């Protein structure tokens, strides 16, 4: 009941087995218009018609896991994503005619082979056929496409296209393979704007993720070689060659949680904030510097984003990676020596119970980063350090003064915003990474008379300037909860073309999004499961609609 149609001539569809596709639209997400969310379409490679049902729930698996990662899981309900069933005349592993013509090179990266059928811009398929009339057709902004992507233009062949990855924010194409490879084609001038990953590979969404950090966040490849020239420099989110501590771009992040500078390989010009990142290697997590540039580039996307708070730590204040000088040491092993370090020390989340009773006389460090993401409001927030007893009492020295502290930290806007990835930009030139970026070190002695006891812990908390807390010292090893999300008529029917997902959120978050005033041509009526806490796995938040 919901489809888009093509029209692919000889440039697309040169054997002509695909000149006339059409192509069922799953949404598997839709929380808010698509003006307000970021939109994601997916397509299926190498899936024959009957195996579409495999295609929608390959999606719905890579999708759920990706986000589980930090930033990605922070606007997990700001994204509205789409499945389109491309249907193949073969499977990918059986060799015949796939709807995207795609091979595995020897370099093992997954291309669009233009050369396979002779389809001279087969790879250009994203920005100039499905993108213009799904935006059209479905996306709520309904642009009408302007250009035939079947005849010859007159001017440039990619300026009329530009306008399709501001409304699409990422497409994406999910081979039907257990084949292990993984491809990112990022080149908004020449219209490139997707990435290629497998359906079951040993690590799928590991894949998925990674390649979504190269299209989406705008990050590079951890593992990339070489000594990166002064306009290299500036235009890289994550990877930099400044070997002065004092004058990396990373600086203010040195030494909070897993971050010290090191060489990505023995000898290596190209240095990494960690080493232990998801864009070096697919096992990890995305590392503070990774998180920070995606949180702020998706914020670019989806306006309603004031703050990026780092998850803070708390630590034995030794002096120890304390100043830039401990630092200068580049190679891989101090990495290592720091986060062993850094383990010794730590006082928070799941090394919370490390604090002991001879913690008298020693100083410990609250520390965060902190992003402003407004160009206009600066920014006030207040930190609060205290010695908590195990039955909830605030711990206090030998004269009954409580052994707590407060700071009051400012974050300045960030004035160089309209220079990161704004919405619109076909490339990312210049950045200053120290614009709204606040780095807040609390650092507290416990005094030498305190009264501790078995048992204690630090507690801390992150303020706004009406009082909300922000981040607390339980936010770190907080719960999880899982939300589903239904679409219905209003007599209880499941939406057709409709196969809601799943997202998690912190224990007792609130939902407050304003759904979409339509799903496919159907007006909104209500909504039941937002504004109220989610306090539970399989919580389900029920979208109805009015069918026609
Ligand atoms: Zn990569
Ligand atoms: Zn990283």
């Not at 059409?22 to 195996?51: A, L």
């Not at 490879?181 to 704007?193: D, L, V």
């Not at 034995?316 to 190679?331: Q, V």
Request: charged letters at 25%.
């Amino acid at each position: 009941e919901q489809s888009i149609q093509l029209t692919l001539g000889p440039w697309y569809s040169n054997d002509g087995k695909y000149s006339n596709p059409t192509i069922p639209v799953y949404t598997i997400q839709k929380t808010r218009s698509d003006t307000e969310n970021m939109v994601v379409v997916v397509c299926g490679e190498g899936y024959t018609k009957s195996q579409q049902g495999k295609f929608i729930n390959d999606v719905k698996r890579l999708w759920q896991d990706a986000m589980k990662y930090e930033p990605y899981r922070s606007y997990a309900d700001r994204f509205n994503v789409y499945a389109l069933c491309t249907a193949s005349e073969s499977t990918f592993d059986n060799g015949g005619s796939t709807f995207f013509d795609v091979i595995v090179d020897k370099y093992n990266s997954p291309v669009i082979s233009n050369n396979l059928h002779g389809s001279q811009w087969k790879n250009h398929i994203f920005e100039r056929c499905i993108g213009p009339e799904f935006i059209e057709k479905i996306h709520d902004a309904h642009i009408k496409k302007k250009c035939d992507p079947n005849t010859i233009p007159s001017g440039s062949e990619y300026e009329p296209y530009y306008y399709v990855h501001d409304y699409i924010a990422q497409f994406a194409m999910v081979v039907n393979t257990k084949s292990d490879f993984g491809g990112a084609y990022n080149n908004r001038e020449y219209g490139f704007h997707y990435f290629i990953s497998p359906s079951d590979s040993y690590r799928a969404s590991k894949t998925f993720a990674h390649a979504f950090g190269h299209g989406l966040l705008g990050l590079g490849d951890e593992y990339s070689n070489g000594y990166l020239l002064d306009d290299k420099e500036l235009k890289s989110l994550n990877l930099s060659s400044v070997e002065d501590p004092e004058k990396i771009k990373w600086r203010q992040l040195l030494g909070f949680r897993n971050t010290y500078t090191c060489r990505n390989a023995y000898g290596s010009k190209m240095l990494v904030s960690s080493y232990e990142c998801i864009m070096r290697d697919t096992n990890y997590q995305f590392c503070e510097v990774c998180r920070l540039q995606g949180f702020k580039r998706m914020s670019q996307l989806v306006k309603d984003v004031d703050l990026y708070v780092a998850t803070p730590e708390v630590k034995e204040y030794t002096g120890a990676y304390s100043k830039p000088s401990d630092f200068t040491d580049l190679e891989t092993s101090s990495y290592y020596n720091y986060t062993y370090n850094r383990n010794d020390r730590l006082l928070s989340g799941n090394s919370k119970s490390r604090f002991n009773t001879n913690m008298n006389g020693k100083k410990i460090e609250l520390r965060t980063v902190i992003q402003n993401i407004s160009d206009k409001n600066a920014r006030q927030l207040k930190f609060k350090m205290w010695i908590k007893h195990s039955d909830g009492s605030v711990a206090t020295d030998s004269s009954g003064n409580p052994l707590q502290t407060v700071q009051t930290f400012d974050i300045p806007v960030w004035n160089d915003k309209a220079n990161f990835w704004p919405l619109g930009a076909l490339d990312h030139i210049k950045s200053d990474f120290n614009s709204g970026l606040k780095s807040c070190s609390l650092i507290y002695q416990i005094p030498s008379d305190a009264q501790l006891k078995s048992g204690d812990t630090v507690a801390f908390q992150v303020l706004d300037e009406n009082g909300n807390v922000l981040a607390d010292d339980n936010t770190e090893t907080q719960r999880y909860t899982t939300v589903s999300i239904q679409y219905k008529f209003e007599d209880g029917s499941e939406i057709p073309n409709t196969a809601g997902g799943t997202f998690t959120v912190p224990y007792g978050t609130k939902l407050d999004l304003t759904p979409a005033k339509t799903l496919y041509d159907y007006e909104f009526i209500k909504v039941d499961g937002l504004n109220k806490p989610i306090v539970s796995d399989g919580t389900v938040v029920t979208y109805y609609y009015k069918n026609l």
